[PDB]
Design a protein around this ligand. Sequence first.
Ligand SMILES: Nc1ncnc2c1ncn2[C@@H]1O[C@H](CN(CCNc2ncnc3c2ncn3[C@@H]2O[C@H](CO)[C@@H](O)[C@H]2O)CC[C@H](N)C(=O)O)[C@@H](O)[C@H]1O
Lengths: 237, 200
Amino acid sequence: NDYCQHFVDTGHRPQNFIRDIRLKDELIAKSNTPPMYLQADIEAFDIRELTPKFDVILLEPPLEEYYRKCWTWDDIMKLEIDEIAAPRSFIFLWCGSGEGLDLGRVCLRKWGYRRCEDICWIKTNKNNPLDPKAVFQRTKEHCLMGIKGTVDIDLIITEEPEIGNIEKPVEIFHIIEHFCLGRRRLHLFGRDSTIRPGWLTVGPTLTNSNYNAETYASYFSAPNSYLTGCTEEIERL
Amino acid sequence: LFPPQWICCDIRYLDVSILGKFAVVMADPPWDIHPYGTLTDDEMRRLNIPVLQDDGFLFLWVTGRAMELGRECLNLWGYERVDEIIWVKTNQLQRIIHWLNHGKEHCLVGVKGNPQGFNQGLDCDVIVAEVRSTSHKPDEIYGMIERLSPGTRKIELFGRPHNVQPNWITLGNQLDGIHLLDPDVVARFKQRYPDGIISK
Ligand SMILES: Nc1ncnc2c1ncn2[C@@H]1O[C@H](CN(CCNc2ncnc3c2ncn3[C@@H]2O[C@H](CO)[C@@H](O)[C@H]2O)CC[C@H](N)C(=O)O)[C@@H](O)[C@H]1O
């Protein structure tokens, strides 16, 4: 059965027809720092104030293409991500499906990472059967994984969200957390709706803030400076 | 011609200028990713892709670090990457098969020049199709390529015998001999290769 032909015939995307650990999530949840968040206009904001250096950065700038303030790849590329990333650390960069697939890789290289996974968010249209340069209908987005220093699959499948909904699948958080990469986790351009235990969310649309660098850093003082996020908390007194 | 045509060769040494111009180029190169016969990064860069097209599309399979290197070659060869096809690899029951398990392979889409009269936007950028033998890419890509550019000349690089299709010329070192029917090509091949085959 040719699902490409079927989509030409009927409009049902080929991905519509793809068919179809607990203890770990529990250790992740016990290990999680309280959610912390900070309203900041990131164009105007000195990210160096975000300390300590992060083990994981999730970067979700609002691209023009999500809306059919927007950030161009010009703005993104000028972010000083490398000044807040721990010497060994990871980045997850949402790149969309256009030129971001190329310009996001330049970014990763500019900030000192190499790509090790290309995670694809494939969008079904079961409930509802173009860029000028596009050759094809674009039905997916890419989240690039980068590493600097020395169970899950690289696909997320969900239904296409309603128009004007720019939220990315919460599954990206489970994939990141299941890598057990460290507990300093930063979400740049997160939102009220994305705040989440074990994460520091920084974005311009947050309506409240509770971030305090000293308080935040106290979650990772000894004996907890090197925990992976997937181990039992270290016993005290 | 129109039926399948092919040329067993080493694509490094074939004077591909004898083949003329194609509306679409597809390639599945044996990138030297860190087992069974590869091309070095420099050999890949030096491939004489630029003579194959004036205006049209390149389809370039990539995996691993070829995702970045293939973008280099793609740009060096004179293309702009305008799309990226994802083949979701399934079994016969439509279930998906370092840090993450890989459920897919990638096919970069480059444009060169200004193509006109292609039916852009008929297919979507996701393929869902059954894994066959190792490295055997899905046949759906030929239907997508045919709807996009019906009846035009097309050329596949690093094809195996099962890759040969109508309107395509397949080059690869595991093809059986030389099978050419387009008289223009037959004439240019006999001029350049009177005694049959050469190197460097
Ligand atoms: N100098 C030369 N001149 C002319 N021909 C040459 C020259 N050298 C070599 N050849 C011939 O090219 C052909 C190349 N085939 C190999 C193409 N690449 C790849 N190899 C290996 N794994 C690949 C891969 N792609 C994707 N994966 C996936 O990745 C994982 C492991 O990496 C796995 O999960 C894989 O699944 C082309 C296949 C052809 N499209 C089909 O559809 O069968 C083959 O015949 C060679 O002799």
